[PDB]
Amino acid sequence: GKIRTKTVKRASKQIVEKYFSKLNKDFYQNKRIVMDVTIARSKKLKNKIAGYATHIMKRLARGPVRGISLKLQEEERERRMDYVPEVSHVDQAIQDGIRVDKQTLAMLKRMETGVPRHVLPN
Amino acid sequence: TMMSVLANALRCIAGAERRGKRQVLIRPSSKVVVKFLQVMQKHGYIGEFEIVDDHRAGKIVVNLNGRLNKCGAICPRFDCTARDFEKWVKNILPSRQFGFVVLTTSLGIMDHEEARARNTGGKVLGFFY
Amino acid sequence: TSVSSGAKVLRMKESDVQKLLAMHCHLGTKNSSSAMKKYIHGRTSDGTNIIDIHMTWEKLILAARVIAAVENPQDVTVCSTRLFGQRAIFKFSQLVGTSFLGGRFIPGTFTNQIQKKFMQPRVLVVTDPRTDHQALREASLVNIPVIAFCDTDAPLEFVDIAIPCNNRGRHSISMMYWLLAREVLRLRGTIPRSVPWEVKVDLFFYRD
Amino acid sequence: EWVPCTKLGRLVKDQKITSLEEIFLFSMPIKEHQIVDQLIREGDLRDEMMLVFPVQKATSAGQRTRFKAFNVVGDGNGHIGVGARVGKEVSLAIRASMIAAKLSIVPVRRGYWGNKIGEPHTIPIKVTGKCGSVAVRLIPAPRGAGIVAAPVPKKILEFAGVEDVYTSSCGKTRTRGNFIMATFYALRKTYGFLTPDLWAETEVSRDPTDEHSEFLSM
Amino acid sequence: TIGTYNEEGVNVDLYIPRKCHATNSLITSFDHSAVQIAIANVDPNGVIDGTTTTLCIAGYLRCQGESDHAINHLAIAKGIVRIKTGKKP
Amino acid sequence: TTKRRNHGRAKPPCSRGRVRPVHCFNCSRLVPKDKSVGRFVVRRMLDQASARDVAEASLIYGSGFPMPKLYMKQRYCIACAIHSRTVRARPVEDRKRRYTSKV
Amino acid sequence: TKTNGQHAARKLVRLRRKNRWADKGWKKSHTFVAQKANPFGGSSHAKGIVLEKIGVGAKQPNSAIRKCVRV
Amino acid sequence: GTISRPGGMRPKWHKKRIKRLKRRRRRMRQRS
RNA sequence: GGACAAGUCUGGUGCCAGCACCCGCGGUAAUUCCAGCUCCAAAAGCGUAUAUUAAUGCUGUUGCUGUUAAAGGGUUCGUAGU
RNA sequence: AUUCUUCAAGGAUACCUUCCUCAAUCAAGAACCAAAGUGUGGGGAUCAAAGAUGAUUAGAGACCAUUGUAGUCCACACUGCAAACCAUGACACCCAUGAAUUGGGGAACAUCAUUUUAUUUAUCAAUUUACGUGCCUACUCAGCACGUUUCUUACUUCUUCACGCGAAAGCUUGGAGGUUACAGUCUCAGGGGGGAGUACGUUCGCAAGAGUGAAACUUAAAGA
Ligand SMILES: [K+]
Ligand SMILES: [K+]
Ligand SMILES: [K+]
Ligand SMILES: [K+]
Ligand SMILES: [K+]
Ligand SMILES: [K+]
Ligand SMILES: [K+]
Ligand SMILES: [K+]
Ligand SMILES: [Mg+2]
Ligand SMILES: [Mg+2]
Ligand SMILES: [Mg+2]
Ligand SMILES: [Mg+2]
Ligand SMILES: [Mg+2]
Ligand SMILES: [Mg+2]
Ligand SMILES: [Mg+2]
Ligand SMILES: [Mg+2]
Ligand SMILES: [Mg+2]
Ligand SMILES: [Mg+2]
Ligand SMILES: [Mg+2]
Ligand SMILES: [Mg+2]
Ligand SMILES: [Mg+2]
Ligand SMILES: [Mg+2]
Ligand SMILES: [Mg+2]
Ligand SMILES: [Mg+2]
Ligand SMILES: [Mg+2]
Ligand SMILES: [Mg+2]
Ligand SMILES: [Mg+2]
Ligand SMILES: [Mg+2]
Ligand SMILES: [Mg+2]
Ligand SMILES: [Mg+2]
Ligand SMILES: [Mg+2]
Ligand SMILES: [Mg+2]
Ligand SMILES: [Mg+2]
Ligand SMILES: [Mg+2]
Ligand SMILES: [Mg+2]
Ligand SMILES: [Mg+2]
Ligand code: NA
Ligand code: NA
Ligand code: NA
Ligand code: NA
């Protein structure tokens, strides 16, 4: 079998997090970078770490990966999410008119507020 | 069949207080039941209760304030001489500092502390604390 | 709710009723439990349960008055394992100043004292008693009261203050948290009651 | 070398919460045995080991032997604690039992038999504790009649501070582990019984964790 | 004045436990499900003033699922929750 | 030690006195009807290969007319239902699944 | 579960009389049968004449000769 | 097996063995 | 040795002789036998046997147990009794 | 446990009918009681104790195969021995939750017929009572089912059932709960394991058997 152990997988995630820029989808250039920024002794381990890092870069180019959490990608994601529409969704729904049921109408008619405006049965 | 109205009523009250209820319904009622409840109420263990009339043996609704730990009847109604109060207190009461044993005497139904003051014996009915 | 002098403030207005109806916050499920049966006001022909709007508002204000009495807002934590509520609790904690826990609840967060993520809240708010069952069970070991948003089929063990509402639906959850945040700020001096709040409810919506 | 990890520990480490009664009032759990060490004066804790026996688990090629130890702790009057732990060595099990005993510490109520002259000397009411098949019953006794109990419960009652009691037992009391726990449960129950002297309402108070909210949030 | 007293006016109890506001039962020191809830008072304007109302719940009520019903009863009795909706003007 | 609350059959107390026995489909052992393991089996008369070859020769089933089937209600004794792997022993806290219907 | 009757003294007395024969300790002291089978006539000691010296082997886990006598 | 240790032969067959013993005693006493 | 207060002492014997109310000890290093020296209990007293009371909520009125440990009659009717 | 025709019963439900403690449980006593078994007449297809033959096996008086008598079935008399079990005595009270089900009734469908108040309120509400479908004379019918909401009786389930209890397995409106905080009423059994449900005596039975029921001795455990 060719399963990568947890020592290899943990190191590869750390390298991609710290040196995402200057890494690409080529094993041979990624290997030179890995040897530069890794202190470990085994040459076999460093080859496996470069291999799994190249695998992650290929995955990242098509979609997010659950364990990476890049800073720049996260910041742009937050900015996109915090979008404020011109008109609130609740305001647009009220202006369109609200339809209720007979049971809901009966409950509203017995309250101190009464049936509010923009409320029609059907 | 039901053989003791007093025992049935005291079991309903003790069961309800164990479950932490606020009110309990008792059926059927009787003169002895009402007198027993009046002794408990005078010492502050139950509170207000009401009797409903139905042209038969009535019904009682009792309000509970959460101060009653246990009540129960004693069957059969053993005779108690005026010098035997300490024996019953030692046997069926948590301590000598609180709790009452209810007796029926020729002067009426009363707790054991009042009976000692009037120097009368009788027959043991029950207890509460 | 009521106050010491019957000032008739804090009562729900026409606009608040409109927001609840527009977001379908009054629509329950078809099932029903014994504990939740007192909050149900009628049932539609389809089988849906209608929640009593008056009871929903009274419980919501009671929850707000409990939260507003905590000196340190970090002593209140909001939890949610449902996907639709993770965004809402994030915005809620940002506005009010509380802590939050989204996703899977790690067991032992409130009981294992030697871990690095040990937490000791004073008040707990959860989105769903059924899915947030682990948080409620832990709160019953370390003396923590619980506020919960409940649907018509929810179990009420370890729940202290239940707010009956629609627990499912991205719009319904967001509106309930938006209403609770606005009331807590109003009970403080932060925002006035005479001017509509400028924060849009769409910020609380869950987005992919 | 103690670094508290709970809000209660930080309050006790500073000179706040000067008594165990503050903790007992609000039912807070105790998760650091250094709290009890600080809140009870030196020369009064008075712990002792009650029972240590081996337990075995069958394995392929033999069995594994461990040691379970029981410990009792308690000041002169009103406090008692019992703990039991397992370890690979007798010394390791004994040390772990002392910590467990301190963590589970409860107050004991005391009262009078007939006349309230000097000081509480007996238990106020009849109590019963049950663990396994063992049930232990404690009955108030008059002054002078001392601790009428078997050697195992007698040692626990002395540490709790009780002076006069009658004792009854039922079940298989030769199981010393259940005998020790049943006595502890009976003494725990003394503060859960509502008597007419406690009817007169109560006054609310703030918990330590919010009275000192500003100090903790640091 | 709560507690047991000597022949002279000396209180000889270690401490006085809390009582549940719903069941009038003592709250022990080994009961870790008991809770205390504080509700803030509100000025004529919707702003808290600094005082609170405190409720104590036994703890076995919480385990059995009756704490929500009990708190409802207590809040109505204390004058915090309105029992029913108002009438139309 | 009581293994099952219903004791392996479908006869509650205070419901019946006696249930008539039936013969096991395999060994002819007599077993009460409510205790036996019963299955309703619908079997095709021919497999796919043989059915195709018969249909070419037949003028009736040659154009979209169903071939007949075999219907049987088989009741097993407990020993025969286990040895034939109709049922198997199940873990505790799993013995309580019921499967009221097919599949 | 017993009567508890207040006029059922006869039933309780009869119940205890019948059930007291079920323990060996009470029955042995009240039956006069063990006394007749006892070589001593209910006494603590007796005198006799020695007939033979015998050796009795010990029970299985032990192993010895016990040096008894026939009287 | 559905029963705990009997400590002997099967109780049904032990009962039958005593069953046959009682007949032989009855016949032997009949001869006198 | 334990229950049960008091020796990981020194010789002899070697599943023998013996001890041991019960659990158990004795086949070559016996904490138990036969002895020496020390030590323990209570003491002008102290062992052993048999009977009896308490231990015993193992006869249970106060106060037992009856699904699986011993123990609910195969089912109804029914008199005395309660 | 097929259908039809008959005979006498039984429970539940409905009722502004009648009566007025007439009841609960029970030594003695009575009736009924699976299969096997017994007696006298019928009947005899199937299966099949005993027996026979063939295999298998070291052996095989067994399991497998082919047979085969009594029995298995009916009528009239006996017997009274079951893991006759829910291994759980009868009567009475309280008791949390969600889905179902068997019988009866009410609402609905169908058929006929033609309270004050209340401008200034609220602490335990003065009316949540809502809702449709299919079949149906060119009559066991003003009928039959279904859908929705209540009620009384019965057998149950929770794998999305609460206290409490128990040595535990487990029980839980139907308790094994409401019990050292030990008392609703009556009755039947048990007191370490064996010897033994044996011996002797006596009652019942055609027999087979059934009921009642010891001791001498022997054991440190047996059991859950
Ligand atoms: K089955
Ligand atoms: K087996
Ligand atoms: K030697
Ligand atoms: K017993
Ligand atoms: K015959
Ligand atoms: K055959
Ligand atoms: K029998
Ligand atoms: K029926
Ligand atoms: Mg004892
Ligand atoms: Mg039936
Ligand atoms: Mg049967
Ligand atoms: Mg088995
Ligand atoms: Mg058995
Ligand atoms: Mg010795
Ligand atoms: Mg010693
Ligand atoms: Mg002796
Ligand atoms: Mg030596
Ligand atoms: Mg004696
Ligand atoms: Mg005694
Ligand atoms: Mg048995
Ligand atoms: Mg029976
Ligand atoms: Mg048929
Ligand atoms: Mg027959
Ligand atoms: Mg014939
Ligand atoms: Mg035969
Ligand atoms: Mg054969
Ligand atoms: Mg044949
Ligand atoms: Mg026949
Ligand atoms: Mg039986
Ligand atoms: Mg038991
Ligand atoms: Mg039992
Ligand atoms: Mg009793
Ligand atoms: Mg015996
Ligand atoms: Mg004869
Ligand atoms: Mg014959
Ligand atoms: Mg016989
Ligand atoms: Na005795
Ligand atoms: Na046959
Ligand atoms: Na059975
Ligand atoms: Na149930």
Author numbering:
A (entry chain AL): 2 to 123
B (entry chain AJ): 2 to 130
C (entry chain AC): 35 to 242
D (entry chain AP): 42 to 259
E (entry chain AR): 3 to 91
F (entry chain AV): 2 to 104
G (entry chain AS): 2 to 72
H (entry chain Bz): 2 to 33
From the study:
Trypanosomes are protozoan parasites that cycle between insect and mammalian hosts and are the causative agent of sleeping sickness. Trypanosomes LSU rRNAs are unique compared to those of other eukaryotes, since they are fragmented and composed of two LSU chains and four small rRNA fragments. H69 interacts with the small subunit rRNA helix 44 (h44) just below the A-site, forming the ribosomal inter-subunit bridge (bridge 2a). Ψs on the H69 stabilize the helix, enabling the conformational changes of its loop during the dynamic translation process. H69 harbors five Ψs in close proximity whose location is depicted in the 3D structure of the trypanosomatid ribosome.
Accordingly, 80S ribosomes were purified from PS and TB11Cs6H1 sKO cells, their composition was verified by MS, and the purified ribosomes were subjected to cryo-EM data collection. The initial cryoEM dataset included 459985 and 552813 particles for the PS and sKO ribosomes, respectively, yielding a 2.93 and 2.95 Å reconstruction of their entire 80S structure, respectively. The resulting EM map allowed us to clearly visualize the entire H69 in both maps. These high-resolution EM maps allowed us to build, refine and model all 9 rRNA fragments (SSU, the two large subunit (LSU) fragments, 5.8S, srRNA 1, 2, 4, 6, 5S), E-site tRNA, and 42 and 34 ribosomal proteins in the LSU and SSU, respectively. Using these maps, we could visualize and model 82 Nm, 6 base modifications including m1acp3Ψ, m62A, m5C, m7G, and 43 Ψ residues. The modeled Ψ positions are in concurrence with Ψ-seq and HydraPsiSeq detection. Interestingly, four conserved modifications (Ψ942, Ψ996, Ψ1747 and Am254) were localized to trypanosomatid-specific expansion segments. The location of eS12 is at the head of the small subunit at the ribosome surface facing the solvent. Closer inspection of both PS and sKO models suggested that ribosomes lacking Ψ530 (sKO) have poor and hardly any EM density in the position of eS12, unlike PS ribosomes wherein the entire protein could be modeled. To visualize the structural differences between PS and ribosomes lacking Ψ530 (sKO), we superimposed the two structures and observed very similar global architecture.
